Design a protein around this ligand. Sequence first.
Ligand SMILES: Cc1cc2nc3c(=O)[nH]c(=O)nc-3n(C[C@H](O)[C@H](O)[C@H](O)COP(=O)(O)O)c2cc1C
Length: 378
Amino acid sequence: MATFPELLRPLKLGRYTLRNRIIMAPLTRCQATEDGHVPRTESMLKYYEDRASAGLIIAEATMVQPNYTGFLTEPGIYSDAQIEEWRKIVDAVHKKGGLIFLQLIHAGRAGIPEKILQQPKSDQDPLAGRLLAASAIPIKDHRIPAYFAASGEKETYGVPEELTDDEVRNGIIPLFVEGAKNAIFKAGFDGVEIHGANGYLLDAFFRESSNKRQSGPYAGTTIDTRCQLIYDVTKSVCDAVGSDRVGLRISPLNGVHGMIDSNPEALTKHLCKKIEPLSLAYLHYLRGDMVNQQIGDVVAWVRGSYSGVKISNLRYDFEEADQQIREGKVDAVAFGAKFIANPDLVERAQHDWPLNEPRPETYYTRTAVGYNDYPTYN
Ligand SMILES: Cc1cc2nc3c(=O)[nH]c(=O)nc-3n(C[C@H](O)[C@H](O)[C@H](O)COP(=O)(O)O)c2cc1C
C-alpha cells in the first residue's frame, strides 16, 4: 500500500494534468549573471532537470523590469539572451516529462539601491535608475543580506519613490505582460506565476503596512483598492497567454520585509472572490508566517472563498500534505527547503525514504556547492 496516496495522485491544473501533487516552490538561488541577468544555463539546467519528477516546478522569481534587481544575480525574462537560455532549461525539464511555470517578480522597495540607482535614467525607459514602490516607506530593521548585496557585505534598503497611477498602469503592468509572453511563447514555459507575495511590489500594494496611498485605483485606504494591482496584473497576463497558463502567489500572514495587515482574513477572502472570475490555473499561498508571529487559518479562508485549484505552502511534511488533500482542504502542496535538499523528493515520497537535510548556510553560494551537490537516495 502507498504511503502518501493522495499526495501522489494526478491533478488537472489549467490546461495540464500534473503527475502528482508534490510541487516545487519558487526558490531564488542567484545562479544567473550580474550584468545581464542571464540564467547560468548548464547549472540551472542540471538543477531543474534533477527535480523534474515534481508534479509542477515553479521556477524562481524572475525579473520583468530591466535591471531592477533585488537579489543581485537573479534571472530576467525581458531580453532575447535570457529567453534563449531559459528555453534550454525548460527543454530539459520537458525531456524528463515535467511541467514548469516561471515566477514573475518586481522587487519594489526591496530593490538593491547600489545597483539600481547607478543605472542611467534615459531613452526608452522612464522607470530606469529609480527605486519604486506603492509608498515612500523603506524596509526597516532588516539589512540587505551579504549574499544579495552589491559589495558582498550587508547593505541598507533605500527609500522608494511612490509610483504614480500612470507609472503603474502604463509602465509596470505592461512589463508583466511582456515577460509572460516571453516566458511562454518564446521560452516554452507551461505557464507563469504572478509574484504577489513576500513584500515585493504587488504584495506591497496589497497589505496595509506598505500601501499608504490616499487616492487613485490602487489606494491603500480600502481592501478592494489594495487588491486592484494584483487583479490588474493577473487579468492582463491572463488576457495575453490564457488564464489556464497563469497562477498567482500570495502570503497574507508572512511578515518578511516589514509586512503586516490588520485584517488578513477579510483581505484574503476578498481577493479570492475578486480573482474567481479569472479562471486561473491555480492560487498558491503561504499559509502562515515565516516570522512565527501572525496567525490565522489561511487554508480555511481560501477553501471557503475560492473554487479553483488551491496550492498551499509553508512547513508541510508529506503526511500533512497528504492529509489536507485527503480532507479536500487543498489540491496540492508546494515544498521549498525540502526541494533544495532532495532532487528526488517525489521518489522519496513514493518509497517513504528518509529526507536529506538542507544546509541554509549554502543556499546562495553561486557555485555547485549547496546547489547541485545534494544527492539522490541510494
Ligand atoms: C533560499 C530560498 C529562496 C526562495 N525564493 C523564493 C522566490 O523566489 N519566490 C517566492 O515566492 N518564494 C521564495 N521562497 C519561499 C519559498 O517558496 C517557500 O515559500 C518557503 O521556503 C517555505 O516553504 P517550506 O516550508 O516548504 O520551505 C524562498 C525560500 C528560500 C528558503
